[PDB]
Paper text:
All known remodeler enzymes use an [name]-type [name] motor to slide nucleosomal DNA around the histone octamer, but the precise underlying mechanism is unclear. Here, we use cryo-electron microscopy (cryo-EM) to visualize the continuous motion of nucleosomal DNA induced by human chromatin remodeler [name], an ISWI family member. We merged the datasets from all conditions and performed extensive data analyses to determine 13 unique structures of the active [name] bound to the nucleosome. Based on the conformations of DNA at SHL2 and of [name], we clustered our 13 structures into five groups (A to E).
Our structures indicate that [name] releases DNA in two steps, by the gradual opening of the two lobes and brace helix movements. In group D (guide strand release, 10% of A-D particles), the DNA starts moving back toward the histone octamer surface. Both [name] lobes continue their outward movement, away from SHL3 and toward SHL2, but lobe 2 also moves upward and away from lobe 1. Despite the opening of the lobes, density consistent with ADP can still be observed between them. The brace helix continues its outward movement, away from the nucleosome, weakening its interaction with the guide strand and allowing the DNA to move 1–2 Å back toward the surface of the histone octamer. Together, these observations indicate that the opening of two lobes and brace helix movement lead to DNA release from [name]. Subsequently, the [name] lobes open and partially release the DNA at SHL2 (C to D structures), followed by full separation of the two lobes and complete DNA release (group E).
Numbering used by the authors:
A (entry chain F): 22 to 101
B (entry chain C), H (entry chain G): 10 to 118
C (entry chain D), I (entry chain H): 27 to 122
D (entry chain E): 38 to 133
E (entry chain W): 166, 255 to 450, 464 to 517, 530 to 721
F (entry chain B): 17 to 101
G (entry chain A): 37 to 133
Write the structure that this text describes.
DNA sequence: CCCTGGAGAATCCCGGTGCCGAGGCCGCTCAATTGGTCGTAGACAGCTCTAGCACCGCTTAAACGCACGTACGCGCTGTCCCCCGCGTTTTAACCGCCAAGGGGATTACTCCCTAGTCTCCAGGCACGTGTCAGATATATACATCCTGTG
DNA sequence: CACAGGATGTATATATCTGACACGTGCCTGGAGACTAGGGAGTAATCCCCTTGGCGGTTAAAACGCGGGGGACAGCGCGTACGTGCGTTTAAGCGGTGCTAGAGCTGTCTACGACCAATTGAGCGGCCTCGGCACCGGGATTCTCCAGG
């Protein structure tokens, strides 16, 4: 697969920014925020896949994701 | 013969399981030995915290004309109270949204 | 049937009925409360274990839990939690 | 005809999305992105639905907090538009 | 085998104590022993040292670095005495900042054209690194009770030096016990007195002290200066004082030194926070009643006003001194304040105005341990001690600040004591120390 | 009746000292209002750390605060301090 | 007539000098008195070791240096050279304090 | 008889106390049972990390023309290296100083 | 005599002499190295214990230590450390 | 040029629906109950050595106040490009349903690993020792900045 | 506008002093060799849950383009607050009484409470079932915003 990062489209980023509380958005914000999302996801997925490899499983689980998020200090209440 | 059993929660007038807390403490590799009063104290602390959060969330849910407490109500109660915000500063509550906050500069003149 | 699993759901429901007599909760909020109780348990227990390690004591006691709640809970929450725990310990020592 | 001024629709959108509590990124594109990222670390990985949902929740919260800090930086710079420089300053102050 | 002043001295005939001390020092040197000359004020220790140095210079040639360790306040006096009595003897002084000290040492010390060097304690501790290469022949120390104790940087460096001869100048060789006397004796003779020290005491102490000490007491040397007159006054404290005392005894106020809380607490309670009345802070009749000793002092004050003059007040606390100053101000009475916080220029102005022939100066509030060996008060009549320190020798210095050869009439001392307090034990220790020192040295 | 307090200890963190800290941080020009704010920030940080350290000292039944107590407090705060234990 | 440096050369020289040195910058006696006053409120009759005050001074120095760095970054972002309490407050807010 | 005693550290070719590490793991309340390869692995990892840090610190000292390492050299080694900086991104090194860092706008022009 | 305390000073000295033939180290730097080794040991052991508890087991093993190393260390250091620890365990189990 | 009107949105009130919470029943496993026991903490005496508090010198570095002038922060103008709001068309998400298989989850076996003991001894820690690396001082030599002048 | 001179700050050597780091030895306690027993985990095998892949239809959403206002950004001017020097002034820093009792650490001894073990039965968790709450849709009240006079 490729190019799927472009699937995080401009209207979605605008909705997220509006929830954040911004009013005017520059044109170059979208590539920067896509990069930020990519690095965040890479960290989380790296840790989750390592947890799953230790578990000797081929399925990544909500518990693995929560453990990774806790290890990074972003505890997620509501998934186990 | 043997007397009727009484739970340690009943002896302490608690609503949280003292026996379960003691079992988790002993099985959790926290220390070699665990005292009698540590589970009671910890259960009381947990009960107080749960009661505080539930009371604030219930007030929030009642103010919005509901009867079910939902994650939005929980997040409202946590983020509108400073001490609970400090306690849960680095916690994401699933499907909780954000508090209404529009900066005064952005408002129309 | 699935293998049994633990939960604080019944005790959360009891406290909820004590506080708000006729207000219910949903499954998502119950899961959030379960996770919150687990997290507070983990943090307090870890602090107590570190205290016991530092003081070179092999037992976890009410003194350790009191010091842990003072360290972790901020301010008036800590004060009220300490008072509630002392009351519970007094009642347990007296009644038993 | 009729044409709202440039910015009142934005404020209505801000109010509405701050009141709402649902997800904003399309689930199938997010899932495809997650699979593509996991392709590098491991081959033939399967995912539970709750895992993808939790990843989505965490990503949304992280981006929302980052955007709030970016708007604070933009206000500090005597501006209303947010810029990549503001995002980078927020990231640098956070320490990432 | 010197009963008379030699011919090389200028402006001096000596009163035979100088020649006796010089003969004793010469005999000790010939035997190869360094001792302590323990004369206490009025018998010319500086004059004895000057005579010894002039003797060494003029007679069999023994030139070398001559060290004169004196308090910084005495440098000018020692220089004046050196230049006035023996002009042939050549002396220099090392003082100033780093630049001045470096310039002076590079111009004079390294060439070594000098004969005598006069330095202070702090200059010595600073310039030890330069005062090590030279060979030391005779080391003269005034007020030897500065190095009276083992350990400290000054004691270590003074024990570091390689000196052919040593000489100590002090008035009170024994202060608290035998330990400081043994320390000085070890400094004199490190091998002889290596031991750490009525058969095991008293008699052996006298036997040890006889060959290595020689002191002549002013009382038996001057045959003048009529004696003292001490009055002991017992003081009951106010009820608020007693309840504060009880609170301090049993126990949000700082509590670190119970001994020195009860101390000032028996002296004046307003030193504590909150003891004084509210925002008015008006001085009227609550300064007196709230302190029992203050009551007695306030009663004696009109008596001192109506009879005699030149009263001296000694206290050990700056807070008590300032409170007494404020009280004397409220009573619209003249006072003069001298303490360690008062710089030298104002010190001199105050003492000059005080010794002025016809002055209205009534109160001279003098802190006991401020200043060194100076301030020649002779017209003073009444000496009052609000408190007494641990050292009876320090108390003796305080009482002899007014008790001087210029004084012609007997002077009176009034002591105020607080009952049911540790002040009784302090007075007992001071009195036993004074008795021991008198029965050991005075006779 | 003659008393005169000296100063508050927050003023002991002098303007030249705050300037030296700013130089080490890498700033060139400083406003005049920075000093009071920096004093307040220092007070807040010190209060948090000292509260944690006093808690540890009290628990150990000790009346003396220790470097290990300070290190434990900083580790709790998330400010690990190497070089003292 | 007398020689003078332009407004900013001495500042940059000081920046280099204090970024090269390793010693502390605040005064031991005032810092110790401040620590004692702060701890007196939490509990009276407290004794402090010598190493505790030094450790507190080290931690405070590191924290203040990091804070000033972030403050300067914010002030440069605002296209200034002067730092201000606004920059301090923004740095604290973004760091989460 | 018996066999001549040789340490497990020298047995695995290390310079770190495998026996002491094993004792610390067993006494630290981490798990109720500890294996045999775990202390060896942990000692090897600690040895590698110590070698890396000491290598960089010695290089910094030799660049600064000295023959003894000080906390300033340790700080210079920890910073200027991305991976060690990320690992020690929350560690304060006592009397370690700060990296030279002057922004371009503050330079004269 | 006085009491006795434990430190990694001698082993740090051995590694220092190995990696730099003539370069000493002072007291403060040695204390910092002791603290660093203690902190890394604490982090790795805690991560291994949490892994064992998550997977519902009771033995800390080389698999747990390797996973903890991968989760803790950032990348290149992680792979180098894993390789050399695997080498050490291989040497230990080869002929011993 | 505030006041007014049109429109657009937001809001409130009923009415019908779907489902998720709430209650009730069954089995069982984990907590309660006694009883015996062994370390672990409490309690107490002795040492001792460091931390207090109120003065008293003495020295030197760092603060403190000050005047001047100069960059710098701050406000105002004006251009202009970029972002916003709206209508349209294309795209793909979203929602149901279906089929197949991989893989998670459980259970039973069995063995090999680790905990626990006991000797035996050597690696490590404390205590005492001595040479050198580093800080400092002082005097050159070098580099940098600032001002005046052709 | 640029160059050249001068003042100041800084880098660089050599010589001294010193106190700490590197080293040796002796003693000790905890690490190592040799043994045992028990139980946790590795392996094999089986069930069924959940993931993946697929299709078809619908409609909300995204992409695209267009027209226009407002906000970013460069520039200009002002007048003020901060940096750079200087002469006083505290106050830190160090070193001394002068006493101290006090708190932390080691050794010894003893009691009590936490653990372990066996037994037993309520307390929970999982399975059902049913009704009130939330939701969706429709229809009819304000409230805001934007031209236009
Ligand atoms: N040359 C002298 N001969 C006799 N008595 C003297 C002499 N000089 C001073 N005195 C007296 O001795 C007292 C203090 O003398 P002091 O300064 O100790 O002498 P020195 O300086 O020689 O030690 C003074 O009050 C003075 O009256």
């Amino acid at each position: 697969l490729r190019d799927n990062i472009q699937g995080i489209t401009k209207p979605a980023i605008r909705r997220l920014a509006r929830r954040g509380g911004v009013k005017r958005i520059s044109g170059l914000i979208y590539e920067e925020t896509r990069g930020v999302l990519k690095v965040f996801l890479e960290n989380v997925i790296r840790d989750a896949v390592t947890y799953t490899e230790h578990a000797k499983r081929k399925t990544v689980t909500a518990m693995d994701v929560v453990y990774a998020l806790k290890r990074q200090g972003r505890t997620l209440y509501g998934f186990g | 013969t043997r007397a009727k059993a009484k739970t340690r929660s009943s002896r302490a007038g608690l609503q949280f399981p003292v026996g379960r807390v003691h079992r988790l403490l002993r099985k959790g590799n926290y220390a070699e030995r665990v005292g009698a009063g540590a589970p009671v104290y910890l259960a009381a602390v947990l009960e107080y915290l749960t009661a505080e959060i539930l009371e604030l969330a219930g007030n929030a849910a009642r103010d919005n004309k509901k009867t079910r407490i939902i994650p939005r109500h929980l997040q409202l109660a946590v983020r509108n109270d400073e001490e609970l915000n400090k306690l849960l500063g680095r916690v994401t509550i699933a499907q909780g949204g954000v508090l209404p906050n529009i900066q005064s500069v952005l408002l129309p003149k | 049937r699935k293998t049994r699993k633990e939960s604080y759901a019944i005790y959360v429901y009891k406290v909820l009925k004590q506080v708000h007599p006729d207000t219910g909760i949903s499954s998502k909020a119950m899961s959030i409360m379960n996770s919150f109780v687990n997290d507070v348990f983990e943090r307090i227990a870890g602090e107590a274990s570190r205290l016991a390690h530092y003081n070179k004591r092999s037992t976890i006691t009410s003194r350790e839990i009191q010091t842990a709640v003072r360290l972790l809970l901020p301010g008036e929450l800590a004060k009220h939690a300490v008072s509630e725990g002392t009351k519970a310990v007094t009642k347990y020592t007296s009644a038993k | 005809p009729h044409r709202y001024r440039p910015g009142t629709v934005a404020l209505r959108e801000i109010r509405r999305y701050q009141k709402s509590t649902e997800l904003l990124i399309r689930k199938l594109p997010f899932q495809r992105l997650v699979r593509e990222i996991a392709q590098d670390f491991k081959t033939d990985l399967r995912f539970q639905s709750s895992a993808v949902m939790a990843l989505q929740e965490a990503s949304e919260a992280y981006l929302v907090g980052l955007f709030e800090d970016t708007n604070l930086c933009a206000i500090h710079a005597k501006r209303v538009t947010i810029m990549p420089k503001d995002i980078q300053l927020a990231r640098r102050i956070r320490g990432e | 085998t010197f009963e008379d002043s030699p011919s090389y001295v200028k402006w001096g005939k000596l009163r035979d104590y100088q020649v006796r001390g010089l003969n004793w020092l010469i005999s000790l040197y010939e035997n190869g022993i360094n001792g302590i000359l323990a004369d206490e004020m009025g018998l010319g220790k500086t004059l004895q040292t000057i005579s010894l140095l002039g003797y060494m210079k003029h007679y069999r040639n023994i030139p070398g670095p001559h060290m004169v360790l004196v308090p910084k306040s005495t440098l000018h006096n020692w220089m004046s005495e050196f230049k006035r009595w023996v002009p042939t003897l050549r002396s220099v002084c090392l003082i100033g900042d780093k630049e001045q000290r470096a310039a002076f040492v590079r111009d004079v010390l390294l060439p070594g054209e000098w004969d005598v060097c006069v330095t202070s304690y702090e200059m010595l501790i600073k310039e030890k690194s330069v005062f090590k290469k030279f060979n030391w022949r005779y080391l003269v120390i005034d007020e030897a009770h500065r190095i009276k104790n083992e350990k400290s940087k000054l004691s270590e460096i003074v024990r570091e030096f390689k000196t052919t001869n040593r000489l100590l100048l002090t008035g009170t060789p024994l202060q608290n016990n035998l330990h400081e006397l043994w320390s000085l004796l070890n400094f004199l003779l490190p091998d002889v007195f290596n031991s750490a020290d009525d058969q095991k005491l008293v008699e052996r102490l006298h036997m040890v002290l006889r060959p290595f000490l020689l002191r002549r007491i002013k009382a038996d040397v001057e045959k003048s200066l009529p004696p003292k007159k001490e009055v002991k006054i017992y003081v009951g404290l106010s009820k608020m004082q007693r309840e504060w005392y009880t609170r301090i005894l049993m126990k949000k106020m700082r509590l670190l030194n119970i001994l020195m809380q009860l101390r000032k607490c028996c002296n004046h309670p307003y030193l504590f926070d909150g003891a004084e009345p509210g925002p008015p802070y008006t001085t009227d009749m609550h300064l007196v009643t709230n302190s029992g000793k203050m009551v007695v002092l306030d009663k004696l004050l009109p008596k001192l006003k109506e009879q005699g003059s030149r009263v001296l007040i000694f206290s050990q606390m700056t807070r008590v001194l300032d409170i007494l100053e404020d009280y004397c101000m409220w009573r619209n009475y003249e006072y003069c304040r001298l303490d360690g916080q008062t710089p030298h220029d104002e010190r001199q102005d105050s003492i000059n105005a005080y010794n002025e022939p016809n002055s209205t100066k009534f109160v001279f509030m003098l802190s006991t341990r401020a200043g060194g060996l100076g301030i020649n008060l002779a017209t003073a009549d009444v000496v009052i001690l609000y408190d007494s320190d641990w050292n009876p020798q320090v108390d003796l210095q305080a009482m002899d600040r007014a008790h001087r050869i210029g004084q012609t009439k007997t002077v009176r001392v009034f002591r105020f004591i607080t009952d049911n307090t540790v002040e009784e034990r302090i007075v007992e220790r001071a009195e036993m120390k004074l008795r021991l020192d008198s029965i050991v040295i005075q006779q």
